[PDB]
Structure 1
Amino acid sequence: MPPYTVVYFPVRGRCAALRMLLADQGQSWKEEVVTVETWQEGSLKASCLYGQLPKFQDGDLTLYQSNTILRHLGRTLGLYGKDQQEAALVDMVNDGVEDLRCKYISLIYTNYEAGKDDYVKALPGQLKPFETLLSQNQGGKTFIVGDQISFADYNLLDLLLIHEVLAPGCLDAFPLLSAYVGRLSARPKLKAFLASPEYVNLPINGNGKQ
């Protein structure tokens, strides 16, 4: 049996990046799907540390928090920079990704209709820091930090992919981010995963908005 288990709703959401990471690294894992019906029964929810999913099992280590899972896999799979300075830069990118993800999450679930045009208005200014980071690392031709992929690459890639669905062509203003999405998405195992039914047939979010 695989040593990893992902416990989540039937959505991409906050597990998309860690699943991309696991698939691209050739690691096996198990998906435990929680219907909202099961969630409303209340017992699993009360058993979660912070009352929420994802829940992740690595053997008998039980983790909550999507970014905790990403950092854990980053540590154990060697996707956390080459040294301590790179690890801090990886964190700096991931915190920035999370900051924009929460804005996206707030739009999707609490204010899609009245807020979308304001959000897409502000989107170039929120993407530009990642373009800048790329431009300062080997001309943007490798990864977001350093010479090797990190968990922040998978999280950033997901963030960019869902924003292209929200605002098609939003990366036309950002040549390095655009080429970066194409480059990472062409990694053989990741390309196969992104094309696979276990990815394609899940909605991005839980309310049918994207």
Structure 2
Amino acid sequence: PPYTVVYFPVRGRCAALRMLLADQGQSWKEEVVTVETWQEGSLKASCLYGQLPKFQDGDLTLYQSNTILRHLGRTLGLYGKDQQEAALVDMVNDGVEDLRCKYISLIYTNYEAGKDDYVKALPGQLKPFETLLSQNQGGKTFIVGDQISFADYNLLDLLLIHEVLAPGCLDAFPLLSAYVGRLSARPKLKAFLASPEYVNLPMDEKSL
């Protein structure tokens, strides 16, 4: 630290890393980039891959949402207890990223027309996470091992996103359901999720 999140005024790909920082009692600065400023071009041209989020940690500048998640996970001890758990954490996060990309494809390229088929296929896309939970201490703890990881925050975000898209989609998955309620009940995270900082921010850039 200090930590600075440079992003558009939406939850989007920064929701999970923000949940992580809040739940971990970290402090950080939000540098909001308006659509107007982005269209100006200078900031975009200076971004490694021409996109946001951009993350500043002291003198270190990073790009890529999952890189930020892994960085915070690595430096704050949220990346498994050993190398085997670390691999499992990656396996979960890669799965979360895959579904997030499918979600992104839906809302940005075929929402109204593809929404129905997507929701029908959703159960099959959520089952893997329910299965992982069932194979780890009966799913009473975290997605991997007995300690929270950056993948828990990313998965939580994706699940919350889908509950909005398809209310009750987690009713068919007892472990995921309890898991979401459990993580959402963690004091610092609960406070964050209920604050205007989170609540009054639109879900996706599509809303911009």
Which range, TM-score by smaller chain?
over 0.9
The TM-score with structure 1 as length reference comes to 0.96
Is 2:185 aligned against 1:192? no
CA distance in 2 between counterparts of 1:171 and 1:26 reads: 28
Once the two structures are superposed, residues 130-150 of structure 1 have per-residue CA deviations (whole angstroms, 9 ceiling, x without a partner) of 000000000000000000000
Shift of 1:108: 1.1
Higher mean C-alpha deviation, range 180-189 or range 104-113: 104-113
CA distance in 2 between counterparts of 1:30 and 1:174 reads: 36
Sequence identity (%): 99
Once the two structures are superposed, residues 128-175 of structure 1 have per-residue CA deviations (whole angstroms, 9 ceiling, x without a partner) of 000000000000000000000000000000000000000000001100
Shift of 1:97: 0.2
Q: Where does structure 1 lack aligned partners over 5 or more consecutive residues?
A: none
CA distance in 2 between counterparts of 1:10 and 1:108 reads: 18
Equivalences, count:
205
Query: 2:171 is paired with a residue of what secondary structure?
Result: helix
Q: Where does structure 2 lack aligned partners over 5 or more consecutive residues?
A: none
Shift of 1:109: 1.3
Shift of 1:111: 1.1
Aligned-residue Cα RMSD (Å) equals: 1.1
1:48-197 matches, within 5 Å, as 48-197=47-196
Once the two structures are superposed, residues 152-204 of structure 1 have per-residue CA deviations (whole angstroms, 9 ceiling, x without a partner) of 00000000000000000000110000000000000000000000010001011
Shift of 1:110: 1.3
CA distance in 2 between counterparts of 1:100 and 1:192 reads: 27
Query: 1:173 is paired with a residue of what secondary structure?
Result: coil
Query: 1:30 is paired with a residue of what secondary structure?
Result: strand
Shift of 1:39: 0.5
The TM-score with structure 2 as length reference comes to 0.97
Shift of 1:44: 0.3
Query: 1:7 is paired with a residue of what secondary structure?
Result: strand
Once the two structures are superposed, residues 21-63 of structure 1 have per-residue CA deviations (whole angstroms, 9 ceiling, x without a partner) of 0000000000000001110111100000000000000001000
CA distance in 2 between counterparts of 1:111 and 1:32 reads: 31
| Ranges of 4+ aligned residues in structure 1 off by more than 4 Å | none
CA distance in 2 between counterparts of 1:108 and 1:190 reads: 27
CA distance in 1 between counterparts of 2:110 and 2:35 reads: 22
Higher mean C-alpha deviation, range 103-112 or range 121-130: 103-112
Is 2:46 aligned against 1:47? yes
Partner of 1:8: 7
CA distance in 2 between counterparts of 1:167 and 1:24 reads: 26
